[PDB]
Structure 1
Amino acid sequence: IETVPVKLKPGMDGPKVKQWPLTEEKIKALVEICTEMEKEGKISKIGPENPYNTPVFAIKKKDSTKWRKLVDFRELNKRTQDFWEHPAGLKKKKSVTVLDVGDAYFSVPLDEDFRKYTAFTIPSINNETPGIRYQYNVLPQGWKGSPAIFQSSMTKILEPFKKQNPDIVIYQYMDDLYVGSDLEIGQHRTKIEELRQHLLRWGLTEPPFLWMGYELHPDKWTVQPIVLPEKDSWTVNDIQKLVGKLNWASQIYPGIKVRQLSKLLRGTKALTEVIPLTEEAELELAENREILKEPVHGVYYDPSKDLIAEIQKQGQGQWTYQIYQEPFKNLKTGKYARMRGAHTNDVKQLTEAVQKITTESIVIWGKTPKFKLPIQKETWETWWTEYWQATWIPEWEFVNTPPLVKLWYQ
């Protein structure tokens, strides 16, 4: 009930980010939502003396039909003071369910002198009426200060369940609670259902998206092995691609040699011609296969550095990705083919991939990576909001020159 004092960083003013164009249907939904939020006192109309702005839009969470207001607080998050005034067990857990606990934030009042900085505008079609201007009175969803200012209340609400269940790992990121078990899905969903009773009990002391449960599990390799083909007959082209792959891998694994295989490439042969491997060549290949079974040397996560995620489009709905802090020191790699209702839409697939990778990232390190997206800026920025279903938003940049490396992950 007593607000926590918040300021910006020294020498930084509040966010002044342009509102981007919204479709009629998103505008209609934001108007209905904000009208109700105003009645409930969560937000208030503001006047022209407030020059700040943060973009707003609307999404639908995964497997739901109802519009949800999403504020893009990325700029405010950067400019908001850090609040110092990660559960390694989570990734190792057998299963994790993700809960939208953001609605809880709305019960905590927001510091009066900070509210101006949460200004947003609902635009009108064709600028025929003035944008409707609001600011928050309470902790807004998507602001980094919100979990940090609610963390005190949150522990008190979870003290029983944790004392009652010392096995379940519980992690909070932004508007999400990550609840990891080792139990069976029936126990799991029930124990999840159990946890839903704590916030209804506290709730009346009604949430729109609190009921949903998003289910996930870890996979076998953190970093996928680099594998080389096993063949009985090698063509010149097969050997050229092999030497290319190994040269690349030698940037990551220092013992890799290609002299004895390259020597097979001595001469000017037809690309489809079959070349018998020499005994020196087979040993070298064998030696390299072995080297590739070992982990990478000198790879460590560092919380003081940014996570970087690269994605490649592999075709036929398949995507590969790598997460690192230093080049050639991958912390996690992966491959996806599983994209729903996107079979003829690249951009929807990529947007889903970005959301999946970001989720994995939050689980492993408790922070989001900066993406390097294989897409033109203008295409991405036109469409990504159509397919976004998460309540956080990572940073991204754009790759305009085709990496030669796509093969090596294929």
Structure 2
Amino acid sequence: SPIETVPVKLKPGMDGPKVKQWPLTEEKIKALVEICTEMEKEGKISKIGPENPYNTPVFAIKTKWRKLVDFRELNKRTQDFWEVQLGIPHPAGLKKKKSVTVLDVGDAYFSVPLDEDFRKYTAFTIPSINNETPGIRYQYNVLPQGWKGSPAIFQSSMTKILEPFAAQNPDIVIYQYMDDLYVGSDLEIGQHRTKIEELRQHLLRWGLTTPDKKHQKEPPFLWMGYELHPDKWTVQPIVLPEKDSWTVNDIQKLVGKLNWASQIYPGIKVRQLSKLLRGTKALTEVIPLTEEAELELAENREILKEPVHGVYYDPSKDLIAEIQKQGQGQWTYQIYQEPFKNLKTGKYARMRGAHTNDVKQLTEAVQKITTESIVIWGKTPKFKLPIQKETWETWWTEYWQATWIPEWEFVNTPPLVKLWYQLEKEPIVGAETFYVDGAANRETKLGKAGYVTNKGRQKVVPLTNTTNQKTELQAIYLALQDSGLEVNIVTDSQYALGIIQAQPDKSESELVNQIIEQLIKKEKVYLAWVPAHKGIGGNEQVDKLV
């Protein structure tokens, strides 16, 4: 009540809400006047004599009716505020305290006074006697529920009411979150209970009620989908439904639960389950689950059968993070400080790059984990990674991008990250030289792929249902098939040269996978490029053939 108000404007040019009242049923009108006389006696609202042009509607709903006040037309018109704390603390980032209590602030918004000049814009009206008589005219003296400014003004008002108490108690830790205060301390019990009663009295002096020690929440705390325990944290228990049929809505809910669990349960995989969502977004469209998807789901149920817990942060200990590969471009990791307990866990996936590579994906995962470490603890982990120094050094030296590689050390746990093949940097003396080309018709969608070599060999292969780029990859696949373990290849396609000079380990296109196999098998492969249709020689004859 004595709290300093936060000044509040209307948006420029805009003026306050004038909205006609809807008719109200007889049972609701008296039930509203009943709440209003009590809110007035408490000073939260006040009657007005209509020199005030504004009005907004008032609904009622329910052994105790509650009052509702639609405020969209006013929230449309008031100024923006500082955005109200997006996100929440991660329990892996909390530090243990010998005592923790949770105070619910009751009537939170109605305890903080509204700015005076702005109050006139919250006027509302109760119709009386079937619109035969004028109704009462109230207006708010405190933050309305559902007003656009209430959460942020209450946040800063609370932060200002806590200032003297934090100043007098440097060692006590307070977390704000909406209606709640979370107080932790290393005081011996009883001294902590005394400090909690001190803070409660200080809060009540500013007009903020809080639960009695008989009503304060008991550990473990059920908070935002976590179980917060005195010495460990975990997610609240996950339930995966068993259904005879699955809509896109159900697969969304399931993928969400599985991602949520993945922060503490290691090894959860989401690739095949989410490939089901790649199609049209119609929410009710029933989709059969695929074989690999139900295998993934059962393998997830296997990990979720056994409960798992995480530990809280200790600043004195080093921050270690370890990464393991799984199938189809999936990676899992643990952030930990101690050998048998994790701070948290997680996953990463290649997220729709058409062709990728194990070292690139491992680097992107280290990037994701570095960003998570900075967010959650304000530092970056020491890394333990399944890759040798020569492998990563060779990749980051050949690679066209710049890249930061943090301090890391080898962990010889298979699968290992390796370079599966290397193109030669210079042409191979003594190795056959294929000139290759491929061409297709964009309308009829049939094409040809072929090659011509310096030994004198020539070949052409028909193709149905193909595209002009797919044929040029097919021509290279042909030269790889028909050569010895050392082969020079000369293509006229920028696209194929880009796909293959990236040295992918994997692709969503089966033809590129079939090329990758041949590249791992061949001992040496030099790939060269020349412009098409320039009569270069070699390429001229291959282009004539196709």
Which bracket does the TM-score occupy, shorter chain normalised?
0.3 to 0.5
Query: Any conservation in 2 of the 1:90–1:169 contact (CA below 8 Å)?
Result: no
SS state of the match for residue 154, structure 1? helix
Which of 152, 171, 176 aligns to 2:156? It is: 152
Alpha-carbon distance, 1:127 to partner: 3.0
Question: What is the DSSP-based 3-state SS (H/G/I as helix, E as strand, rest coil) of the residue aligned with 1:132?
Answer: strand
* Larger CA deviation: 253-262 vs 181-190: 253-262
Moved more, 95-104 or 73-82: 95-104
Let me know the Cα RMSD of the aligned residues.
Answer: 20.1
With 74-83 and 310-319 compared, the bigger mean Cα shift is at 310-319
Cα separation, partners in 2 of 1:19 and 1:362, compared to 1, 3 Å: farther
Distance 1:99 1:186 in 2: 17
- Match for 2:357 among 340, 345, 351? 345
Given the alignment, which residue of 328, 345, 354 partners 2:340? 328
Contact conserved, 2:220 with 2:229, CA < 8 A, in 1? no
Q: C-alpha deviations, 1:3-45, integer Å up to 9, x for none?
A: 4331122343333455556555543343133234445554333
Q: What secondary structure does 2:333 align onto? A: strand
Q: 8 Å contact 2:232–2:309 — kept in the other structure?
A: no
Q: After alignment, is 125-134 or 233-242 more displaced?
A: 233-242
- Cα distance change of structure 1 residues 280 and 193 upon mapping to structure 2, 3 Å threshold: closer
Q: 1:364 to 1:246 in 2, by over 3 A?
A: closer
Mark the CA change 1:129 to 1:291 in structure 2 (over 3 Å): closer, same or farther.
same
> For residues 232 and 41 of structure 1, do their structure 2 counterparts lie closer, same or farther at Cα, with a shift above 3 Å needed?
closer
1:335 & 1:326 partners in 2: Cα distance?
A: 20
Instruction: Determine the C-alpha separation between the residues in 2 that align with 1:35 and 1:253.
Output: 53
Residues 298 and 270 (structure 1), Cα distance of their counterparts in 2 relative to 1, 3 Å cut = closer
Distance 1:141 1:48, change over 3 A: same
Counterpart position of 2:76: 78
- Structure 1 CA distance for aligned equivalents of residues 170 and 140 of structure 2: 37
Shift of 1:118: 0.6
Contact 2:359 2:417 in 1 (8 A): no
Q: Quick check: 2:387–2:416 contact (8 Å CA) kept in 1?
A: no
Superposed displacement of residue 357, structure 1: 28
* Residues 360, 228 of structure 1: alpha-carbon distance in 2 compared, 3 angstrom cutoff: same
- Is the Cα contact below 8 Å between 2:43 and 2:141 reproduced in 1? yes
| CA deviation vs aligned residue, 1:359-390 (integer Å, no higher than 9, x gap) | 99999999999999999999999999999999
8 Å contact 1:101–1:210 — kept in the other structure? no
Cα shift readout 1:255-282 (whole Å, capped 9, x = no counterpart): 9999999999999999999999999999
**1:121 to partner: Cα distance:** 1.6
Q: Structure 1: how far apart are the matches of 2:24 and 2:358?
A: 22
Q: State the 1:134 CA deviation.
A: 1.6
Out of 233, 236, 244, the residue aligned to residue 245 of structure 2 is: 233
Structure 1 regions of 5+ residues with no counterpart? none
Larger CA deviation: 335-344 vs 5-14: 335-344
User: C-alpha separation between the residues in 2 aligned to 1:134 and 1:26?
Assistant: 17
Whether the 8 Å CA contact 2:221–2:229 is kept in 1: the answer is no
Q: Distance in 2 between matches of 1:404 and 1:185?
A: 51
- Of Structure 1 and Structure 2, the greater helix share is in 1
Q: Report the CA distance shift for 1:268/1:37 in structure 2 as closer, same or farther (over 3 A).
A: closer
Are residues 273 and 301 of structure 1, via their aligned partners in 2, closer, same or farther at CA, if it must alter by over 3 Å? same
Q: Which has the larger radius of gyration?
A: 2
Task: Give the match's secondary structure for 2:102.
Answer: strand
1:125 has 2:129 as partner: yes
Q: Distance in 2 between the 1:351 and 1:123 partners?
A: 66
Structure having greater relative contact order (Cα 8 Å, sep ≥ 6)? 1
Unaligned runs of 5+ in 2: 84-89, 209-217, 423-546
| 1:54-99 alpha-carbon deviations (Å, 9 max, x no partner) | 333457xxxx966655534344334321234999969999999876
- Contact 1:19–1:121 (CA under 8 A) maintained in structure 2: yes
Distance 2:388 2:371 in 1: 24
Is the CA contact (8 Å cut-off) linking 2:6 and 2:114 kept in structure 1?
Answer: yes
**SS of residue paired to 1:110:** coil
Q: Match for residue 30 of structure 1?
A: 32
Q: CA deviation at 1:120?
A: 1.2
| 8 Å CA contact 1:375, 1:398 repeated in 2 | yes
Report the secondary structure of 1:349's partner residue.
helix
Aligned length, in residue pairs = 405
- Contact in 2 for aligned 1:109/1:137 (Cα 8 Å): yes
Please state whether the residue corresponding to 1:323 is helix, strand or coil: strand
- Native 8 Å contact 1:119 1:135 kept in 2: yes
CA contact (8 A) 1:368 1:394 kept: no
Q: CA deviation at 1:296?
A: 19
- 1:242/1:185 Cα in 2 relative to 1: closer, same or farther (>3 Å)? same
Report the Cα offset of residue 158 of structure 1: 2.2
Equivalent pair of 1:16/1:52 in contact (CA under 8 Å): yes
Measured against aligned partners, the alpha-carbon deviations of 1:268-315 in whole angstroms (never above 9, x if no partner) come to 999999999999999899889899999999999999999999999999
What is the rounded CA distance, in whole Å, between the counterparts of 2:122 and 2:168 in structure 1?
38
Moved more, 120-129 or 258-267: 258-267
Instruction: Look up the SS of the partner of 1:178 in the other structure.
Output: strand
| Cα-to-partner distance string for 1:200-219 (whole Å, 9 max, x where unaligned) | 23339x99999999999999
Bigger Cα displacement from structure 2, 49-58 vs 367-376 = 367-376
The 3 A distance-change label for structure 1 pair 163 and 128 is: same
Aligned to 1:189: 193
SS at match of 2:154: helix
Would the aligned equivalents of 2:258 and 2:270 in 1 still touch at CA under 8 Å? yes
Conserved 8 A contact 1:312-1:406: no
CA distance in 1, matches of 2:329, 2:420: 18
Q: In the superposition, relative to structure 1, how do residues 352 and 280 fare at CA in structure 2: closer, same or farther (>3 Å)?
A: closer
CA contact (8 A) 1:175 1:391 kept: no
Cα shift at 1:329: 28
Q: Does the Cα contact within 8 Å between 2:391 and 2:418 map onto a contact in 1? A: no
Q: Rate the CA distance shift 1:119–1:88 in 2: closer, same or farther, 3 A.
A: farther
Change (3 A) 1:305 1:264: same
| Conserved 8 A contact 2:81-2:152 | yes
